[PDB]
Amino acid sequence: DDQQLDHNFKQMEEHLALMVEG
Amino acid sequence: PQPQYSYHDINVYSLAGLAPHITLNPTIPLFQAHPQLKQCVRQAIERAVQELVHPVVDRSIKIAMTTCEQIVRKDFALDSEESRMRIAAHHMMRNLTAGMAMITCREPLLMSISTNLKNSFASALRTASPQQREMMDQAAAQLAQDNCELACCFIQKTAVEKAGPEMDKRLATEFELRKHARQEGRRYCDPVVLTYQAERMPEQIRLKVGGVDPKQLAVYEEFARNVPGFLPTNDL
Amino acid sequence: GPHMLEREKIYQWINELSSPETRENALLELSKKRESVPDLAPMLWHSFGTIAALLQEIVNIYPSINPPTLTAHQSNRVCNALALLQCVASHPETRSAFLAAHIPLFLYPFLHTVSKTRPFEYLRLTSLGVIGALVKTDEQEVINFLLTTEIIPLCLRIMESGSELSKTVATFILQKILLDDTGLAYICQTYERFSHVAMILGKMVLQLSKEPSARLLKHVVRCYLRLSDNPRAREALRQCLPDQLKDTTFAQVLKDDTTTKRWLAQLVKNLQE
Ligand SMILES: [Cl-]
Ligand SMILES: [Cl-]
């Protein structure tokens, strides 16, 4: 339950880190 | 948090529909020492709704109008029955208009209800002790928290009742195309949509020419069953 | 052959998006396949009730916004829908119709939330990721849409009070708008529009001197540098530019940031008479 939110949250942080720069 | 009110509990015709639903906590300390201040609660809640109902309704309808129009035209482009299209459009238009009215009024209502109660309490005590001002602030905050959902439902339902004719106006030409085609003895089919579906869409998800499958209408039926801010009309 | 049997699972899931009793599983599976299926977005848009179901997943969490009660399960579910909507917003075959239906307008309430919980932060980031996907296309209609739907005031609120990542994504959005010629002319059209943007950028420079952020500083500088291309904005910047950008306040943080040093140097030269 709370593990999947954290897993999805870390992936969005990775996604937004590439989007803002690249 | 669960909604308290069903769609048919709140009479929108007048502001007097609020009065039978005003929650007035009996343990509020300001009313323990000054019971005569209970009377100005109704007018403050009515006043806060009166100043926000028109601007929120116009904005909430404006935001949901174009979205519902474009998606309904797209979904029912190969359906010659304007009856189904009109019913589905209202189910979605009311649902999205109620949602946008909820987002728009919840915060300004808490502010307006609190402010109107503070001024009504102050005009009844005139010169008030700082101890009495703590009572009026706690009461205004408590009453706003306890009646924000009611005032929000009043504005929502007002916006929903007005979205009916507004959605009909936006879909006027779409209704006439299907009515004029029926009188010429033929089904209506958007030529652009018919070409695209027939040429580009896979069979399993293609729009069907012979109306729409009733089991695929579950989306629009859910729009009418589960409205944001109100109790669902039925289960499932 | 073998890949055709997988496409039938895609079709069945899209059809299962309509019924609420099968939507949650279909949302989950389709979000996973949105990177491997290039034509998923036109299939999502042109199928019956699919977009309507995604809008339904969004509006159904509005009661959870105020009072803030959004749970982890609700945030995961609605972000699967926002993921598929992002797929539609990116595809060139559905981007125009996505904007014509004014679909981003129903993500704006999420950008207005201030709750610091992870369900609300994951919601704001996902919503911001949808808007980010739009501006990454560098399309003129994306700029015209955002200029007219009042998303700039939403970004400035996030740029002033959001998390470190939220501030950076919101600043990146405002940057992409400013980079486009129409966006620069729109913000510099009246002093009321420009002054409200310059004040927010000014406050962010003070915040960055206390809590430093390399990527946030980079795009705050890019916004300032782009504003200096406009004559009316250039005159006002000469009296309102934060001194921390003209002295050596950010000298140590920018030591290894070549591009930001170049942008910051070009900025100070642009303001010189
Ligand atoms: Cl963590
Ligand atoms: Cl009465």
Q: Write the single-letter amino acid at B234.
A: N
Contact between C87 and C44 under an 8 Å Cβ cutoff? The reply is: yes
- Which residues neighbour C262 within 8 Å (Cβ) at sequence distance 6 or greater? none
Which spans in chain B are helix H?
A: 29-33, 40-50, 53-75, 82-125, 130-170, 172-183, 191-200, 218-225
Residues B146, B138: Cα–Cα separation, whole Å:
12
Look-up: residue for tokens 């989306």?
B219
Q: How far is CA C60 from CA C78, C83, C87, in A?
A: 9, 16, 21
Structural contact between residues C194 and C232, judged by C-beta atoms closer than 8 angstroms: yes
Q: Are C215 and A20 in contact (CB under 8 A)?
A: yes
Amino acid making up residue B111: M
d(CA C224, CA B45): 46
| Closest Cα in chain A, distance from residue C63 (Å) | 20
The CA distance from B118 to C35, in Å, is 55
CB C128 within 8 A of CB C84: no
The domain tally of chain C equals: 1
Q: Please report, for residues B167, B224, B226, C17, C76, the alpha-carbon distance to residue B220 in angstroms, rounded to integers and kept in the order given.
A: 15, 7, 10, 12, 23
**Rounded distance between C-alpha atoms, residue C51 and residue C48, angstroms:** 8
Distance CA C44, CA C256 (A): 45
Domain that holds residue C269: 1-273
Instruction: Go through chain B and list every residue after which a break occurs, taking a C to next N gap over 2.5 angstroms, comma-separated.
Output: none
Instruction: Collect all residues with Cβ–Cβ distance below 8 Å to C269 and sequence separation of at least 6.
Output: none
Backbone angles phi, psi at C114, to 5 degrees: -120, 0
CB C191 within 8 A of CB C206: no
Q: What is the number of alpha carbons within 13 Å of residue B88 lying toward its C-beta? A: 28
Angle between helices C191-210 and C164-179 (to 10 degrees): 140
* B and C adjacent (3 or more CB pairs under 8 angstroms): yes
Q: Does C94 touch chain A (CB under 8 A)?
A: no
C204 to each of B57, C33, C158, C198, C235, how far by Cα in Å?
Answer: 36, 39, 11, 10, 21
Tokens of C61: 């969490």
Residue with tokens 């069903």: B6
| DSSP code of residue B14 | S
Q: Which chains touch B (3 or more CB pairs under 8 A)?
A: C
Q: Using the structure block, give the residue that is written with the tokens 């306890």.
A: B146
C53/B219 touch (CB, cutoff 8 Å), yes or no: yes
Q: Give me the torsion for CA of C228, C230, C232, C237, rounded to 10°.
A: -10
Classify the phi-psi angles of B23: left when phi > 0, otherwise alpha if psi is within -120 to 50, otherwise beta: beta
Q: How many CB atoms lie within 10 A of CB C254?
A: 19
Whether a cis peptide bond, with omega within 30° of 0, leads into B108 is: no
Structure tokens at C19: 């019924």
The span from the CA of B234 to the CA of B227, in Å, is: 11
The candidate with the shortest Cα–Cα distance to B229, out of B104, B45, B68, B46, is B104
Q: How was this structure determined?
A: X-ray
DSSP reduced 3-state for C47: coil
What CATH code is carried by the domain that includes residue C12? Answer: 1.25.10.10
Structural resolution in Å: 2.7
Q: How far apart are CA C15 and CA C26, in angstroms?
A: 9
Environment class of B201 (CB within 10 Å of its CB; exposed 0-12, middle 13-18, buried 19+): middle
- Give the angle subtended at the CA of B153 by the CAs of C24 and B233, to the nearest 5°: 50
Q: Nearest Cα to C134, choosing from C163, C105, C158, C162?
A: C105
Task: Find the residue in C nearest to A21 (Cα).
Answer: C215
Which of B103, B104, B217 should be substituted to probe chain C, the one whose Cβ sees the most C Cβ atoms within 10 Å? B103
Which chains form contacts with chain A, at 3 or more CB pairs under 8 Å?
C
